[PDB]
Short mmCIF file of C-alpha atoms in Angstrom, two decimals:
data_model
loop_
_atom_site.label_atom_id
_atom_site.label_comp_id
_atom_site.label_asym_id
_atom_site.label_seq_id
_atom_site.Cartn_x
_atom_site.Cartn_y
_atom_site.Cartn_z
CA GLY A 1 36.90 10.45 -20.13
CA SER A 2 35.88 11.66 -16.69
CA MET A 3 36.03 8.55 -14.53
CA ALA A 4 32.88 8.37 -12.43
CA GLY A 5 33.15 7.49 -8.76
CA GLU A 6 32.11 4.06 -7.54
CA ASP A 7 28.99 2.51 -6.08
CA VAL A 8 28.83 0.25 -3.04
CA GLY A 9 30.64 -3.06 -3.31
CA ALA A 10 28.03 -5.61 -2.31
CA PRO A 11 25.03 -5.73 0.03
CA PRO A 12 24.61 -8.10 2.99
CA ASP A 13 23.78 -11.35 1.25
CA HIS A 14 22.37 -12.17 4.66
CA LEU A 15 21.49 -10.30 7.84
CA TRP A 16 21.16 -11.46 11.43
CA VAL A 17 19.19 -9.30 13.83
CA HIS A 18 21.09 -9.18 17.10
CA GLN A 19 19.82 -5.90 18.49
CA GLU A 20 16.59 -3.95 18.22
CA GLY A 21 16.80 -2.37 14.78
CA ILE A 22 20.19 -3.92 14.17
CA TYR A 23 21.52 -6.70 11.97
CA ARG A 24 24.75 -8.59 11.43
CA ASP A 25 26.29 -8.99 7.99
CA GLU A 26 28.10 -12.04 6.66
CA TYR A 27 31.43 -10.27 7.05
CA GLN A 28 31.27 -8.98 10.61
CA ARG A 29 29.34 -5.90 9.55
CA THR A 30 26.72 -4.48 11.87
CA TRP A 31 23.58 -2.93 10.42
CA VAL A 32 20.92 -0.66 11.86
CA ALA A 33 17.44 -1.61 10.72
CA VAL A 34 15.18 1.36 11.35
CA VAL A 35 11.72 -0.14 11.02
CA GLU A 36 9.80 2.71 9.45
CA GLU A 37 6.16 1.72 9.14
CA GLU A 38 5.02 2.96 5.75
CA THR A 39 1.69 4.66 5.12
CA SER A 40 0.52 1.30 3.82
CA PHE A 41 3.60 -0.89 3.90
CA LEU A 42 6.65 -1.96 5.88
CA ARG A 43 10.09 -0.42 5.51
CA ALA A 44 13.19 -1.52 7.38
CA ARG A 45 15.95 0.98 6.68
CA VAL A 46 19.15 -0.96 7.25
CA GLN A 47 22.03 1.40 7.91
CA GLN A 48 25.58 0.08 8.11
CA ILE A 49 27.58 1.61 10.94
CA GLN A 50 30.12 0.66 13.58
CA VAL A 51 28.27 0.04 16.82
CA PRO A 52 28.80 -2.37 19.72
CA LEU A 53 26.16 -5.07 20.00
CA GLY A 54 24.58 -4.73 23.42
CA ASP A 55 21.82 -7.15 24.33
CA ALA A 56 20.83 -10.09 22.15
CA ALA A 57 17.15 -10.88 22.56
CA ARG A 58 14.00 -10.15 20.60
CA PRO A 59 12.93 -6.66 21.71
CA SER A 60 12.37 -5.38 18.20
CA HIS A 61 10.42 -8.50 17.31
CA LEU A 62 8.52 -8.16 20.57
CA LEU A 63 8.04 -4.43 20.16
CA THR A 64 7.84 -3.97 16.41
CA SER A 65 7.46 -7.60 15.40
CA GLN A 66 7.97 -6.93 11.71
CA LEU A 67 11.59 -7.47 10.74
CA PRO A 68 12.65 -11.12 10.41
CA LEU A 69 15.33 -12.83 12.48
CA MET A 70 17.38 -13.13 9.31
CA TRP A 71 17.35 -11.89 5.73
CA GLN A 72 18.45 -13.78 2.64
CA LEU A 73 19.45 -11.75 -0.39
CA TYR A 74 17.47 -13.39 -3.17
CA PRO A 75 17.61 -13.09 -6.96
CA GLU A 76 16.24 -10.19 -8.96
CA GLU A 77 16.68 -7.54 -6.29
CA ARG A 78 14.99 -8.45 -3.03
CA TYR A 79 15.67 -10.02 0.35
CA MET A 80 13.99 -13.22 1.46
CA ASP A 81 13.47 -13.66 5.19
CA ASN A 82 13.26 -16.97 7.01
CA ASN A 83 9.80 -16.38 8.42
CA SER A 84 7.90 -16.63 5.15
CA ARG A 85 8.10 -13.27 3.43
CA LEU A 86 10.16 -11.46 0.82
CA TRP A 87 11.33 -7.91 1.41
CA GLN A 88 11.95 -5.73 -1.62
CA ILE A 89 15.19 -3.77 -1.66
CA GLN A 90 13.69 -0.30 -1.82
CA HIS A 91 17.16 1.14 -2.32
CA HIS A 92 20.75 0.25 -1.51
CA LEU A 93 23.55 2.79 -1.64
CA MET A 94 26.28 4.39 0.44
CA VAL A 95 26.21 7.77 2.14
CA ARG A 96 28.73 9.43 4.43
CA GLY A 97 30.71 6.21 4.20
CA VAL A 98 27.63 4.38 5.40
CA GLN A 99 25.62 1.79 3.52
CA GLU A 100 21.90 2.41 3.81
CA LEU A 101 19.85 -0.56 2.67
CA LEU A 102 16.11 -0.02 2.43
CA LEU A 103 13.96 -3.11 2.84
CA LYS A 104 10.29 -3.13 1.90
CA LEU A 105 7.99 -5.92 3.01
CA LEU A 106 4.80 -6.68 1.12
CA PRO A 107 1.86 -9.05 1.66
CA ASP A 108 3.27 -11.79 -0.54
CA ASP A 109 3.15 -10.11 -3.93
CA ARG A 110 0.01 -11.49 -5.53
CA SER A 111 0.92 -14.70 -7.33
CA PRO A 112 1.67 -13.99 -11.00
CA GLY A 113 -0.55 -15.60 -13.60
CA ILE A 114 -0.03 -16.04 -17.32
CA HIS A 115 -2.45 -13.43 -18.61
CA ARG A 116 -3.39 -14.21 -22.19
CA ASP A 117 -1.25 -17.01 -23.56
#
């Protein structure tokens, strides 16, 4: 009988990198992917904010060359690129009226095998 707040509505089922460290949602929502190389992994902090899309090349891919040209929200709780990798949604929430989606890329999670039966 308190009535908790409310969590984000829904993440970007898909993202389209238009600017270095930026991505476009499927609802005209710009994102800011802050490629943050992990100690031993890849993290692309996608922050949702209102910013004008400047250029439209592949500077981030040329510079960083980590984030895909498009993400595809897959089942479970991860984002599947179009290159040939699956990024794990490290965390997705909203802060200061901004949606910060954390994407973690791994070296193709070792194929699962039926261990014992």
